[PDB]
Amino acid sequence: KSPAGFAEKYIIESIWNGRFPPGSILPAERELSELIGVTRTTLREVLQRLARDGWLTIQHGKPTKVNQFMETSGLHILDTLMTLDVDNATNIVEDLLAARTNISPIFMRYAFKANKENSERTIKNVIESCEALMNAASWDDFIASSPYAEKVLQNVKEDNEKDEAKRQEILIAKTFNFYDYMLFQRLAFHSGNQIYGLIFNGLKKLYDRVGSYYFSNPASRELALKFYHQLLETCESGQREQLPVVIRHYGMESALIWNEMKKQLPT
Amino acid sequence: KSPAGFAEKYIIESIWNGRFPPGSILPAERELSELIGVTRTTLREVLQRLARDGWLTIQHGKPTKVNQFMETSGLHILDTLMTLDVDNATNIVEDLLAARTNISPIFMRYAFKANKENSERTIKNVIESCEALMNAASWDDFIASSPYAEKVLQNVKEDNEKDEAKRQEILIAKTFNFYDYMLFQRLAFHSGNQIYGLIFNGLKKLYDRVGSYYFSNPASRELALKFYHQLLETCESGQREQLPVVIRHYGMESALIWNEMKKQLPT
Numbered sequence: 001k002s003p004a005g006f007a008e009k010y011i012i013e014s015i016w017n018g019r020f021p022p023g024s025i026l027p028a029e030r031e032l033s034e035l036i037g038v039t040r041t042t043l044r045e046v047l048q049r050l051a052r053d054g055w056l057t058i059q060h061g062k063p064t065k066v067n068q069f070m071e072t073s074g075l076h077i078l079d080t081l082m083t084l085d086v087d088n089a090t091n092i093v094e095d096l097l098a099a100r101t102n103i104s105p106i107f108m109r110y111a112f113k114a115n116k117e118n119s120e121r122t123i124k125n126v127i128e129s130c131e132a133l134m135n136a137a138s139w140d141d142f143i144a145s146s147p148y149a150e151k152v153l154q155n156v157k158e159d160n161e162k163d164e165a166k167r168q169e170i171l172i173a174k175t176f177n178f179y180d181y182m183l184f185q186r187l188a189f190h191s192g193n194q195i196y197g198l199i200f201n202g203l204k205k206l207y208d209r210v211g212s213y214y215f216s217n218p219a220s221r222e223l224a225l226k227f228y229h230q231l232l233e234t235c236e237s238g239q240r241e242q243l244p245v246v247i248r249h250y251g252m253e254s255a256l257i258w259n260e261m262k263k264q265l266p267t
Numbered sequence: 268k269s270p271a272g273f274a275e276k277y278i279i280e281s282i283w284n285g286r287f288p289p290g291s292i293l294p295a296e297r298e299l300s301e302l303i304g305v306t307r308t309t310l311r312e313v314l315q316r317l318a319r320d321g322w323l324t325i326q327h328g329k330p331t332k333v334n335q336f337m338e339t340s341g342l343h344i345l346d347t348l349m350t351l352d353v354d355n356a357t358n359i360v361e362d363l364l365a366a367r368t369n370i371s372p373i374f375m376r377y378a379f380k381a382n383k384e385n386s387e388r389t390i391k392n393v394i395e396s397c398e399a400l401m402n403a404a405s406w407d408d409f410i411a412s413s414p415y416a417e418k419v420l421q422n423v424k425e426d427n428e429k430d431e432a433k434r435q436e437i438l439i440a441k442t443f444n445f446y447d448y449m450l451f452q453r454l455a456f457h458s459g460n461q462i463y464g465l466i467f468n469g470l471k472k473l474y475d476r477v478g479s480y481y482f483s484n485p486a487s488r489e490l491a492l493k494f495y496h497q498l499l500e501t502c503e504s505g506q507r508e509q510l511p512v513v514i515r516h517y518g519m520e521s522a523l524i525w526n527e528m529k530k531q532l533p534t
């Protein structure tokens with residue numbers, strides 16, 4: 001769908017996986033254009049957006065280079081993080097998603113063990129809210145109920161989509177993501193190790209973008225809700241050993257939904 | 268024994284664990300002083316150093332406040348991160364160390380299964396250098412040998428300690444840390460998931476501060492080297508499942524060395 005979007009995605013992912021290492025000089029524009037298979041004019045502007053997003057270093061009368069990162073530019077991994085999306089950084093997102101599956105069994109294990117009460121409260125609260133989000137006649141109906149109408153309206157907004165039916169779906173997606181984030185992030189802080197909770201805080205904007213996209217699929221919400229229940233039942237039963245299975249199982253099943261939805265992406 | 272260092276440590280860790288949330292108002296200087304148990308004039312200069320380091324917001328005739336950090340200031344987790352050391356953020360560092368123990372079995376497992384050869388090569392490369400660092404007559408002797416004399420001189424420097432005997436010891440500690448970092452960071456990138464490798468990159472400065480301190484103890488170096496060997500044997504034997512045991516064991520033994528060394532910290 002988008003040749004410009006594809007070129008941006010390729011370069012970014014090439015930098016990410018080390019083909020275009022953070023210090024290196026980018027392949028010549030001619031060779032780079034031939035490589036990715038896009039028009040030379042398209043590539044030349046993609047490089048400029050990519051240098052504004054903080055991936056590249058463009059300079060008059062000099063070879064284009066990949067940026068050094070690691071506080072070299074100062075807040076150089078984060079100014080780029082603001083530009084990350086599902087379209088242009090699919091592999092970066094999937095790595096984060098994989099890591100989320102890998103590490104969740106760790107901090108949720110700590111949380112169910114030292115904060116058995118708090119964990120159950122969190123998961124129950126997410127389940128009730130999500131289940132009230134679904135089942136509702138409309139998004140407004142959900143907001144009209146719910147003890148946290150204020151908190152949700154603060155964090156969930158479209159204000160751009162004007163088609164009533166479409167804005168409704170977007171709001172449902174963002175609201176469900178809102179509670180998915182809450183479940184993982186809050187259980188992360190209940191681990192006793194602030195670093196797990198802090199990671200989610202740092203990545204909330206990207207989290208919101210991918211989540212609002214992922215949970216626009218009804219199956220995504222059904223699967224997650226069912227997964228939340230498994231978490232609750234696993235916690236109250238004190239069955240630790242099942243945690244890595246439940247989470248990895250959900251990671252697998254959510255993976256196949258993700259891959260079906262990965263099709264139809266314009267890049 | 269440093270009361271000023273303690274006050275700073277208390278405040279920093281209190282922000283970390285949520286007692287003083289990123290938005291909150293700090294307790295008034297007198298009460299905060301009674302609270303931490305340090306003289307208010309000492310606390311008054313500690314607050315000023317803390318506001319220069321980017322933790323607090325002080326204003327004449329107004330309540331001192333904690334800073335927002337998360338994206339509020341935008342990319343603010345780095346302005347504070349550069350000031351952290353073993354003295355003023357002991358608990359923050361211990362959280363990072365625990366997380367390192369928790370997650371290492373994850374990305375090292377991926378690396379041993381998908382990169383068995385490169386993993387063994389990496390571990391062999393680290394073991395040989397460390398064993399050459401030890402056994403060597405001095406740091407200069409290690410540098411005079413070693414195929415990577417240039418690379419190490421680029422990354423390992425004192426340039427401050429004037430006692431030749433003391434500077435020599437510092438260089439040995441920094442050099443061992445150099446290879447400890449290499450083992451974890453490179454196996455993390457060999458996991459296939461760039462995010463694990465990137466975590467170490469982002470925390471390298473703190474890693475170096477803590478490591479040069481930790482590996483200034485000969486037993487720490489002795490212990491780590493033994494651990495590296497076990498990693499090699501775990502990889503070559505293909506016994507992945509043993510990985511979390513080997514790593515948690517080392518986490519245990521390095522912990523008690525850490526705890527013994529925690530005595531004599533001025534804070």
Ligand SMILES: CCCCCCCCCCCCCCCC(=O)SCCNC(=O)CCNC(=O)[C@H](O)C(C)(C)COP(=O)(O)OP(=O)(O)OC[C@H]1O[C@@H](n2cnc3c(N)ncnc32)[C@H](O)[C@@H]1OP(=O)(O)O
Pocket residue numbers: 015016017018021022069077078080081092344392393396415418419453456461464465466468469470
């Ligand atoms: C706040 C905290 C979290 C922050 C985190 C947040 C993340 C928020 C997400 C946002 C996401 C957007 C921001 C992404 C921005 C990117 O950074 S993109 C991601 C890609 N980043 C990368 O660094 C690429 C990964 N790959 C690499 O770094 C390199 O390939 C490696 C792993 C360092 C090298 O791999 P290798 O094959 O094993 O090479 P190796 O044999 O080890 O030799 C390398 C060097 O070590 C030297 N060396 C080798 N052996 C020895 C020895 N025994 N002694 C001394 N030197 C030696 C070699 O001489 C060589 O020297 P150089 O010529 O390179 O200078």
Ligand SMILES: CCCCCCCCCCCCCCCC(=O)SCCNC(=O)CCNC(=O)[C@H](O)C(C)(C)COP(=O)(O)OP(=O)(O)OC[C@H]1O[C@@H](n2cnc3c(N)ncnc32)[C@H](O)[C@@H]1OP(=O)(O)O
Pocket residue numbers: 078081125126129148151152186189190194195198199201202203282283284285288289336344347348359
């Ligand atoms: C870029 C890569 C990443 C980098 C990443 C950093 C990397 C790292 C290395 C650096 C190293 C330096 C290190 C620096 C150190 C620091 O500068 S940061 C130190 C700590 N910073 C923090 O932000 C810790 C913050 N902790 C907290 O905010 C809280 O403890 C928690 C855990 C999030 C909340 O606990 P909680 O009891 O479960 O709270 P909860 O029940 O959910 O209620 C809170 C809100 O949720 C709402 N709520 C509750 N139930 C519902 C419901 N059903 N529906 C809707 N709303 C609800 C409530 O209404 C309430 O609303 P608010 O009135 O507060 O606005």
Ligand SMILES: CCCCCCCCCCCCCCCC(=O)SCCNC(=O)CCNC(=O)[C@H](O)C(C)(C)COP(=O)(O)OP(=O)(O)OC[C@H]1O[C@@H](n2cnc3c(N)ncnc32)[C@H](O)[C@@H]1OP(=O)(O)O
Pocket residue numbers: 093094096097098099100101103104177180199200203206207208210211214215248250251252254255258376377378379380381
């Ligand atoms: C933590 C903080 C991050 C959070 C950062 C926040 C930002 C986050 C971005 C967007 C946030 C939106 C979040 C809301 C919207 C959704 O919730 S989107 C949800 C969509 N779901 C996904 O994309 C799936 C994520 N990916 C995954 O969960 C994992 O990659 C999968 C699918 C479970 C695959 O697991 P895998 O270990 O990575 O790969 P795989 O080789 O197939 O599995 C290894 C198996 O072979 C064996 N094996 C182990 N190692 C190896 C090896 N190296 N080679 C071969 N075999 C191996 C193992 O035995 C294992 O089997 P079992 O352990 O079960 O016995």
Ligand SMILES: CCCCCCCCCCCCCCCC(=O)SCCNC(=O)CCNC(=O)[C@H](O)C(C)(C)COP(=O)(O)OP(=O)(O)OC[C@H]1O[C@@H](n2cnc3c(N)ncnc32)[C@H](O)[C@@H]1OP(=O)(O)O
Pocket residue numbers: 109110111113114191192193195360361363364365366367368370444447466467470473474475477478481482515517518519521522525
């Ligand atoms: C993401 C960042 C990556 C890292 C990026 C590093 C960069 C940041 C700079 C530092 C880099 C310098 C490094 C170079 C210089 C050295 O090499 S310094 C190394 C010195 N060593 C240390 O400081 C010790 C590190 N700490 C550890 O390894 C682990 O905390 C320990 C010592 C193994 C113990 O932690 P633990 O496993 O979580 O707790 P533990 O009770 O002993 O055993 C686990 C049990 O606790 C229970 N538990 C229940 N609730 C909890 C809870 N809330 N918490 C803990 N355990 C719980 C569990 O049920 C669990 O059950 P089981 O395992 O028995 O089945």
